[model samples]
Every structure is written in C-alpha cells, then in structure tokens.
Target: SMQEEDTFRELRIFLRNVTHRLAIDKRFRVFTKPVDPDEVPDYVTVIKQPMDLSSVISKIDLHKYLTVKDYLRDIDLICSNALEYNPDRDPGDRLIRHRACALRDTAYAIIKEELDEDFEQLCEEIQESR
Candidate 1:
C-alpha cells in the first residue's frame, strides 16, 4: 500500500502535466482567434469570402493517429504489469493496478473526446464548404 500510494502520487503529478499540455495544445488550435461581427465584414472583404478548409484538409495532421497509439500501448503495459496475479505480493500491488486503470481511463477519455470533436469539426467544415 505504501509503495502504491507513492507511485500513485508520482503518477498523479505526471498526469497533471500531460493534461495541461493537452489543454494548451487544444486551446492553441481551436480558440486562438475570436470572431467578432465587425471583424467578419472586414474579413469577408479582405478575403472576398470565407475560404473553405476542405482544400487544405489533406494537409492537416490531427496527430491523434500517432499519439493515441502510443498512449494505449503505455496503458496496456501498465495494466499488464499491475494486474498480474501475485501469490505472495504486497497489498500495494492492487493499488498500483487501480492507479493505472484510473490514469488510463482518464487519458483515454480525453483523447477519445478530442479526437471525436476534431473529426466532427472537420466534417462540419467540409459540409459548410458545400
């Protein structure tokens, strides 16, 4: 239990860092610019019209394909190591597994949520272009 608690404390710190980075990255991409009504007319005039992103879709890299793959691989390793049956193991073993599950689920949920939203947004942009 002591070891698991310590490990969990460390893992929690790591997870916090990861989440913060992810949040920063998302904000940079999605919320960097504010659309004002006044800006819109100027924007339209300057650009002549709203340019569709469809033309550039192929150039966009979601990065999820690589990131999620690596994340799930790490989760798989943690679960396998943490949940193995130990005939004479310390109680801390269970706690480690619990922590792994919690961390993995939290990460998976975040990644999946963002990935889905990105895909949805991409689709919306494409449809808007039509």
Candidate 2:
C-alpha cells in the first residue's frame, strides 16, 4: 500500500545509508541479531575495534543525516497528534496510535544506538584516566 510505504520511505532510506556507512569500516560487523550463524545465507567477518564515532559520522553524508533528523521530528509530530485525540476510545484510531508510537520508538532507537556508543567510549576514557 502506498500509504504504508509513504510512512516508512524516509526511514528505509535512512537505514540503508546507515548500513552502507557501517559496511565501509573494516572493524564494524553488521548482522541480524536473532539469526543463527550457520543458518544465515551470507555474512561478513571483520576484525573488531573500538568505533571512532566522529569518523563514522563524518563518513555518512551530511544531507542523509539531516534527512533522518527531519524524519524523526516528523514522526514525533504524528505520534503527538495521534495521542492528542485519545485514540483509546476507538479501536481503529487506537491501532494507528500504537503503530505510530512503535515507529517513533524505533526511530529514536536508531539514533540513540549511535549516541550510546559514543557515551560508552567517553565513560571508558574517564574511568581509565581516574
């Protein structure tokens, strides 16, 4: 459905760019979490190292990152509007609100994962210095 696709199109592109950026780094290994190793159709093996957050962010095109930020903000607005209506009284509106909330969380998770890595590195450095 066009509407479904429209809802996720920006998110899809944002994720694709994230995957490509990660792939270019030899130290990063990308994989599906729940998949069995041998059962996977294919995979890449890479030597692991602490990620350079700034370098990785630099590798990603600025416009693409901005696009993701924009999309995240838009999803927030959609979720807010849905919630403002108090969809709980109507089953169909409730479903829409639920899906929007889920997507909003997911969009946040995508950005949060990257920021969390950077924060972890900062904490490690602070601990080492103490």
Candidate 3:
C-alpha cells in the first residue's frame, strides 16, 4: 500500500472535504468522538476496531490514508459500530441507531458521487473485492 509516488495528494484532500460534510453535522456530535471502552464496559468486547469521525480526521491529517477506499472503510466502520451496539432503539431512543442510518446514507450518497468523479478503478475494485 505504497502510493507515495503520486503522494496520495488526491485521497487526502478528498477525504478532508468528505469528512467536513460528515463531522460538522450537529446530529453527528456523539459519533465524532469515541466510545470510551472503560465507560462502556462491553464496548471493547463487542466492537473489534472502535472507530470515530475524529479518528478518521486525525488519520487524514497524518496522511495515513493509502487510498479513497481506506477512507470509506473507516466511515463504514463508524456507522456499523453504532448499528451493532444500539440496534435501532428508535421510536423511543432515536439516539444511536437512527442517526447512524442517516449518517450511513448521507456518506454513501456523497461517496458514490465522488467515485463517479475520477476514482473509477477504485469503485470497481470494491465490487471485485466483494
């Protein structure tokens, strides 16, 4: 995963823009930070790799991203983590699950649109990976 030749300039810049759409949403506040394992108790046991929007932002700032696909992976992880734990507490507790659903939809739409830009091969690579 060494694309340092082209310098990963595109992915870094693209993800920075994408996360701006995601992280700045007022409804996504809780998802921006982390679910502290010590406080949540079973969170660490349930989730394999705990992720958050801030962590993704930090990764982008550090230039740790190898590809746009890796950026999508972290976004997907944050949504799934909420869905897994909360599991649709809606109609009563519309805090975690429902917001995650909106987050997932919002992200998928924007990301798919971005893929239609110049990341053509990256889009097909995901379908092939499936």
Candidate 4:
C-alpha cells in the first residue's frame, strides 16, 4: 500500500470527511440524493450531468473516486447541475439554487482547505502516476 493502494485508502478518508461535513447542514436534505426524472421529466435531458450526495457517497463506498480531482469534480458537478436547470429568475427555482450554492461552498471549501496540503499532495501524485 505504498503507492496507488495507499492513495485509495486516503481518497476514501477524504471523501468520507467531505460527505459528513456537507450532510450535517439541514439544507443538504434536498441534495442528499439524485434528481428524480420521474417527477421532473426533462431533468436528465436538460442536465447533461447529474450528481448528488448519494451518488458521491456511493462512489466512495464503491471505490469510484480514483483521485482527489475525481471527488472534487463531483463537488462542482452537483452544484453546477442544480444552477443550470433551476435558473434564478424564477423564485421557486432560485430557492433550490440557493441551497445548491450553500452545499457547493461548504463542500468545496473543505476540499480547498485540504488542497493546501493533504489533498494537494494527492493531486500532484496523481498527475505523475494516475
């Protein structure tokens, strides 16, 4: 576990921490799972990429996150996806977008803080060998 294997171990720890931190906020309830196309029929079509808490968490459990960047993109993915579909011009949509922005900032803030060191090193190691 000195190289890639060790990276796997650390990646999960980082993602686990992010999940816990973001989910603690009550507003995260709306973000805790993927969007339901069953309810919003055009959701999948309008949103090319869809992401949510369960998707990322399940990725961690299933070892889908191969690097710090991988998890980080999902951070942006989930947030950006929300804003794109729910334009702020409409009050209803803006309400959901607001929550999305909040969750996005918290998740990204944690990752950004870690990136100055631990996560940063992992990302660098990836470019050399990923």
Comparing 2 with 4 on TM-score, the higher-scoring candidate is 4
Off by over 4 Å in 3: 1-7, 88-94, 120-130
Tens digit of lDDT per residue, candidate 4, span 84-116? 888868897988899888887887777777745
The C-alpha TM-scores of every prediction are 0.35, 0.35, 0.76, 0.83
By TM-score, how accurate is candidate 1? 0.35
**Candidate numbers, best TM-score first, in rank order:** 4, 3, 2, 1
Q: Which candidate should be chosen as best, given TM-score against the real structure?
A: 4
Residue 75 C-alpha lDDT in model 3: 81
lDDT tens readout by residue for model 1, 24-70: 45322221123244844543343322211121121122221122343
Write out the backbone clash pairs for model 4: none
Clash tally for model 2: 0
Shift in Å, residue 89, candidate 1: 6.9
For each of the candidates, give the backbone clash count. 1, 0, 0, 0
Better of 1 and 4 by TM-score: 4
Candidate 2's C-alpha runs over 4 A off are 1-69, 84-88, 115-130
Model 1, position 93, has a per-residue lDDT of: 52
Q: Worst ten-residue run, lDDT, model 3?
A: 1-10
At residue 63, candidate 3 shows an lDDT of 72
Best candidate, lDDT: 4
Per-residue CA lDDT of model 3 for 1-130, tens digit only, reads 3443344666677778989888899988878988886787988888989999989999998976766677778888898888787765466336777788788888889878765554646634533554
Q: What TM value does model 4 have?
A: 0.83
Pairs that collide, model 1: 1-92
